[PDB]
């Protein structure tokens, strides 16, 4: 036993594997159930023919063409133009 501490305070070690980022970009022929962009907040909202997952995962609702749309920050929707 003691009267101080089991370990020295003031740390700065031990990081975490991160990720996230974009998987599919504009001009991509994805298939129904294809991950587009991963995130945690709301950087890219779902567009026409696109759904949102639990941790906000824009996936392809159907086969088409991945297209990005922006109105100048604030919110960026991602629609998919089906072929034929």
């Amino acid at each position: 036993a003691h009267k101080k501490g089991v370990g020295s305070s003031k740390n700065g070690r031990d990081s975490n594997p991160k990720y996230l980022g974009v998987k599919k970009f504009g001009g991509e022929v994805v298939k129904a159930g294809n991950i587009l962009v991963r995130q945690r907040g709301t950087k890219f909202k779902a567009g026409q023919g696109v759904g949102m997952g639990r941790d906000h995962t824009l996936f392809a609702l159907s086969d088409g063409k991945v297209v990005f749309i922006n109105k100048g920050k604030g919110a960026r929707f991602i629609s998919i133009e089906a072929a034929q």
């Binding site: 036993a1 003691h2 009267k3 101080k4 501490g5």
Partner: protein, 113 residues
Amino acid sequence: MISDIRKDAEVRMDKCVEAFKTQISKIRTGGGGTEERRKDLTKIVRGEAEQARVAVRNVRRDANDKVKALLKDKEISEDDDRRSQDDVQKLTDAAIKKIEAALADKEAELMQF
């Protein structure tokens, strides 16, 4: 933790040195030196320096045990033992350095006349 003992050591130390440095001035009656009556007076000064040396050693043989027997209770590892030594030395040696330096001036006055 050394930043805590350093103060407690310097404060108590300088507090004594600053005290004796003022008490020695109470011994000088005036001029000092009246036919052979110069060395006999120095005897009183020897006591001031003698008590000073001990006072400087006490804090060293008192504050050390407060940490030595403290880092053994599974709180502080080694590499700090010698670190604490070089910490009290800069205070002990400095103190004695001021004592001898002060006595050098005092003796130059008690024998001046």
